[PDB]
């Protein structure tokens, strides 16, 4: 009766990413946060075990992992290092427009370099004046012969400066219809007129570089176009339907690491002559953390299976999975700090970092407010 | 990619129980509550379509439905009538000790009558002084030759007076070890010295009879014994591991009926010149209801698949599924009343009944407090 | 240091209403709910001790109680019988438009009969198509010589059929400006063309009659006019600023009765060899109930003192006090049922009635959704 | 009608501390957090306006501010800089044992230096193995002639290394009765054998030094004794009854600063062509923040008035006020980050610091779990 569980192959994958995460990523997580530096040790360990971008098709040299397998990878990394989990999460985000909409030529150019780990991808959608409202974006792409000229800026770009390739959405007709006047382009780190802003100083995922992209008359070839002129925002929304699920998986892993840590601690710490775990108020808090986490996990996996099949109700299930898991991770990490007492408030234990990291999952890949808008729309239509 | 969803056969089953529920059960639900009367129309409709006790093995004339199929049945009935949903839920509860522990003879005597719908089963575990603490039960069974003499009382017995057979747990050795001095027996409605208390006057599931069992020197044959002398409470705990999942399914169905009703209403009701559904605060409430309901549903189905396979972590997953779903149903039904305004507070709409019914799911089949104890124990061991 | 507490006189008043409530009201509360009948024993006890309408000025034969004293009265009654608490709460609601806007003649006609207890007042604002949106009300009043002719209907009217006088708001100019085309009138139970609908069948406050008013060409004298033609809705909003505070006080009293009952019970009930009160998970639930209740109480009293002084921020504080207290009462009463287990779900204990009653406090005197709208408006302006 | 509000004098005080806070403290708050450095600019501004230790009696050169005035001071500072708010909060904590239990001589020695601002006080109660369980503390004080010899360690000491005087509790008889074998002593920064641990690396209140005290055969005179030998822990518990209220006030101020910031931002930020404040889901979030904050504020002020009068129910009201306000501040600051979107997650806005700071209020001055224990005990006795 093989219902409502991952395959044996999924559980073998879980065990393999967990070994890489616990051995090679976990020891660097505190230093990555504390120095706000790219998790380079994690990148090398993930590249060596083909966990840096596992979703890429076997035809491009990739692992060809299904959406659920890719979720389990992001979850198991996020359990020890949220910054590291963004390597496969943002590699999928930046590549998904090519995978969903790109010509065979565009895919053949870029996906093999992702698969081999020679390049990371970033995704440039958000702006200073258009964050949630991406249809109002002002970055523009203008034909000049066979070339495109890009002018404007993207805000908040994960892995900027480390990524070699940038999937960028820009307005291709300022007079075209709202939502259907945008196109997607692959931009290279050394394209002319392309600079980075100063790294953002963040609450959490501090090792993950977060930087503005500045486009000053960036001239790129005509073959950088991903999909059809004007269909870029449709491609971006379709991308979001898959990638929101992976942030739900990230939220689940962060919450799981915090719960793992809190459970180990309250079994050992003694006060008033017994283990903290022996206090029934503590037992109720642990049961709440575990029940909500497990509900969030199963909902992420249901949305992941929907992502793999492209189920017609993926928008609802993905928006629900991402909003629920991030809300639950925020609550669980706030309680994991609580359960360690004073120790929990110090950077000598990892639970305060896990709480600071959990907060991003409620904001990026669609704010939980936008997620509630999307859910209500899917219910009422 | 057939992961994390019910089978096509499960969805055909869902459609068939939903037709019986909407056509034959739903029209009587208000009158069943209002007159506090047994849902007789629902019993006949369920018996005619073999949905009254679908878990019974095909070898006993039963449907042989898996634990997930049985959950979907209880859910789809509970969506229109919570009292009616207790026909298959309590038929499973009362029969499960026979199915888990009974001799071939005991099973052959009782299960065919359940399968055909000639008899309903009840489960007599709780008492006046031993509710949560069932190991402290005082009802006693004493050998008299080949017979057993039962003395005491059971409290809160669902379907009492309607059920023909009562699976009753009693102390078989007041000096034996705590938890291992109890045995299970099948008691018949016409066994001598066996009476019923006055029906309880309840907040909700008002059509479901709830009555004390009084045992005054009840003499029954030796072959009424279910399993081994002293193993009755082990059988009762094992039963609970499966049946808690079905109350989670009941909670999911009640919440789904309330959400279905609230969604239909806020699309039609207009205030300040627009549909109530057009207010973003309302949209956020609907998204919260739907997200939490969907998380509770997937968690119930994960626990149901664990029940079918007898997964070693069934205790955790069942306790989590039942506690989560009932907590979520309490919150959703309280908001469904809210969303109808004044109308919601009147018995002319069904959402106030759905709120009164939701509250029982937090109490029976282990209080949500006992569920948190069980969850914490499974985490810490 | 006499800061942040009621006066000694307030505490003497509290003790006096508590005696009347515990001796004369509490014994009838269950029967009042169970038979859905007016709390006549409570009315007579309240009239005999001048607690039926204590806010009326001493110049009209009244007690002249301040807004805080009147809150304490409603709270102490609502602790034992929510239906009874609506006698002074709705007596204030129906009289407040006369007190805020009425001529000396109108006040002199009606307030002495309220003060003596010869008449109760009702308030007719809501309609079938205009509940939250009262500015869209369709009930009309048309001059005919010195008379007014009323046509339409009011929905949900508390104490209808028992009250002698009805303060009714009606459109006095269907072409006048939105919100400034409505007037208030005193309607008598025996005015011609005036009938009542069938009593609503409610979730709770079942003894409180709730009935439609039907106006079929109701001819009333010109001197029935309360305040100025067109200022009726301004008077209604001003009324709401004071009366919302009294529903917050009602919510506090219902929650207090449920907590009083739960605390007494968990000290006595034993399971697993100790008092339920000895379980730390239970202690945490009790601390949550008590802390939230006490916060809600102090906020109601702060809003009551604002009501007495007519502080410029009364809208915010009243809306906050009513929304907070009713939300907290819903949560506390749902947990009070929980803490009694099975007993809590039966009508033999009062906590299920207290939960059914608590739910109305979130809906009437402005839904908690309208309260959040009002709060946000006061913050942002 | 002067009920349920601060005095005119309190509101003049509020305006005066708010000017010092907005002009002199607020500009340094970000740099204080970012460099984890003592808020020296705030200390000088507070000392110059007599807001560094306002509770000290006029007989010692102090302001003599009542407990409510002192709460308003801590609140108004905590609104702009939580680290700065600990100057008057910890000055009261460390001095309160002298004020409650000290001889006239001890008070005359130390309180004038606090009043003038020549010295800050710290409080040394907690240890590595005795945090919540202070009766199990192991730091010892041993008579040697007229001297005392202190040996052990205190953990988590706020303002350590900056404070000149340390009120330290130590075991004076390892064989005396539990809770009645502890005494309080004033320790000087230059007492022999007295060192500090390395500053803790914290989630928030990063400018507030937090350091272990190490006592290696610390010899101090007999006149350092505060109160009676063996009554130190009674003095510590009594201190906590007053000081918990001031952490509730701190939590209120942090939440108020976050709400002030979020409200200003959502009025200005536009998305989808309107102000964020114009979205009703946002309006509901703002109403929730404001209602809960206002309930927490009024409850803190009720507990403060109880602290001033020494009301017999101060334990309950203080524990409730501190637990409620800190829980509410955690929720409000987490939502204030949310409402700024990406900006909220960056250290360029202050709301992420306010969230990191809010988390300490749930842990120190008795964890919210200990607060629920204390509340339950006061309810059940
Ligand atoms: C660390 C970080 C990493 C990121 N990574 C990337 C990335 O790699 N690539 C990329 O393109 N983007 C990225 N983002 C951008 C992120 O998706 C945006 O911050 C988010 O979309 C919100 O936009 P905003 O920050 O402008 O907030 P705004 O859109 O200004 O929203 C502000 C507030 O208003 C609310 N709001 C907005 N619209 C509505 C509405 N219609 N109804 C109700 N409430 C509403 C929001 O929920 C929020 O609470 C990242 C963000 C951060 C902080
Ligand atoms: C309508 C209805 C139908 C029922 N149907 C059946 C049925 O068919 N057959 C049957 O045998 N039973 C049935 N039950 C019984 C039900 O399972 C019991 O009510 C439940 O087990 C609780 O027992 P109690 O009511 O005695 O509460 P108690 O056990 O007295 O508990 C009272 C309160 O204390 C809490 N509590 C108890 N122990 C602990 C602990 N260790 N830690 C923390 N908190 C604790 C509980 O959660 C509860 O909040 C039914 C109950 C009802 C009301
Ligand atoms: C038992 C009872 C007693 C009452 N007593 C009286 C009385 O004595 N006199 C009297 O005149 N009235 C009385 N009322 C009426 C009561 O005030 C109304 O029910 C209430 O105002 C809501 O109106 P409605 O029921 O038409 O709900 P609707 O206004 O139809 O609202 C339905 C739902 O939409 C929500 N909603 C409405 N507008 C908005 C908005 N702008 N933004 C977001 N959500 C919105 C509501 O909060 C609610 O959840 C009573 C009601 C009841 C049930
Ligand atoms: C930044 C900071 C500043 C501080 N300032 C000072 C100060 O100036 N002076 C000073 O003396 N102290 C100070 N403290 C100490 C603070 O009061 C302690 O951290 C707190 O008392 C908890 O002790 P602990 O950290 O050892 O946690 P523990 O006592 O080990 O508790 C760990 C967890 O168990 C829970 N727990 C403990 N006992 C029970 C129980 N009986 N029932 C249920 N749950 C329980 C706790 O709530 C917590 O969640 C400070 C702490 C910090 C972090």
UniProtKB/TrEMBL annotation, chains A, B, C, D:
**Per its record, how is this protein called by name?**
Probable acyl-CoA dehydrogenase fadE25
* Positions of the Acyl-CoA dehydrogenase/oxidase C-terminal domain: 230-380
Q: Which UniProt keywords apply?
A: FAD, Flavoprotein, Oxidoreductase
Q: Name one GO molecular function term.
A: flavin adenine dinucleotide binding
Reaction(s) catalysed by this chain's protein:
a 2,3-saturated acyl-CoA + A = a 2,3-dehydroacyl-CoA + AH2
Say which family it is in: Belongs to the acyl-CoA dehydrogenase family.
Q: Which residues form the Acyl-CoA dehydrogenase/oxidase N-terminal domain?
A: 7-118
Q: Which organism is it from?
A: Thermobifida fusca (strain YX)
Annotated Acyl-CoA oxidase/dehydrogenase middle domain residues: 123-218
Cofactors, names only: FAD
One protein family per Pfam: Acyl-CoA_dh_N
């Amino acid at each position: 009766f093989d219902l409502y569980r991952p395959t044996e192959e999924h559980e073998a994958l879980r065990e393999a990413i967990r070994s890489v995460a616990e051995d090679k990523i976990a020891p660097h997580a505190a230093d990555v946060d504390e120095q706000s530096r790219f998790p380079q040790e994690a990148y090398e360990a993930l590249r060596a075990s083909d966990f840096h971008a596992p979703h890429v098709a076997e035809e491009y040299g990739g692992v060809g992992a299904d959406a659920l397998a890719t979720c389990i990878v992001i979850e198991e990394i996020a359990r020890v290092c949220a910054s590291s989990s963004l390597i496969p999460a943002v590699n999928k985000l930046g590549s998904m427009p090519l995978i969903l909409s790109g010509s065979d030529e565009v895919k053949q150019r870029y996906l093999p370099e992702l698969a081999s780990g020679e390049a990371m991808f970033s995704y440039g959608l958000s702006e200073r004046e258009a964050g949630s409202d991406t249809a109002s974006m002002r970055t523009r792409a203008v034909r000049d012969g066979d070339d495109w000229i890009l002018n404007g800026q993207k805000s908040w770009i994960t892995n900027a400066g480390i990524s070699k390739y940038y999937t960028v959405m820009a307005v291709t007709d300022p007079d075209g219809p709202r939502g259907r006047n945008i196109s997607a382009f692959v931009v290279h780190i050394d394209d002319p007129g392309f600079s980075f802003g100063e790294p953002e100083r963040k609450l959490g995922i501090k090792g993950s570089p977060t930087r503005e992209l500045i486009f000053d008359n960036v001239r790129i070839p005509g073959d950088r176009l991903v999909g059809k002129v004007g269909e870029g925002l449709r491609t971006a929304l379709r991308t979001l339907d898959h990638t929101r699920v992976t942030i739900g998986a990230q939220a689940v892993g962060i919450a799981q690491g915090a719960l793992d840590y809190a459970l180990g601690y309250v079994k050992e710490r003694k006060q008033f002559g017994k283990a903290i775990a022996d206090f029934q108020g503590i037992q109720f808090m642990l049961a709440d953390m575990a029940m909500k986490l497990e509900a969030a996990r199963q909902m992420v996996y249901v949305a992941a299976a929907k992502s793999e099949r492209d189920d017609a109700d993926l928008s609802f299930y993905g928006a629900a999975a991402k909003c629920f898991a991030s809300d639950v991770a925020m609550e669980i990490t706030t309680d994991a700090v609580q359960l360690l007492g004073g120790y929990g408030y110090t950077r000598d234990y990892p639970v305060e970092r896990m709480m600071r990291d959990a907060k991003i999952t409620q904001i990026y890949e669609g704010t939980n407010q936008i997620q509630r808008v999307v859910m209500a729309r899917q219910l009422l239509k």
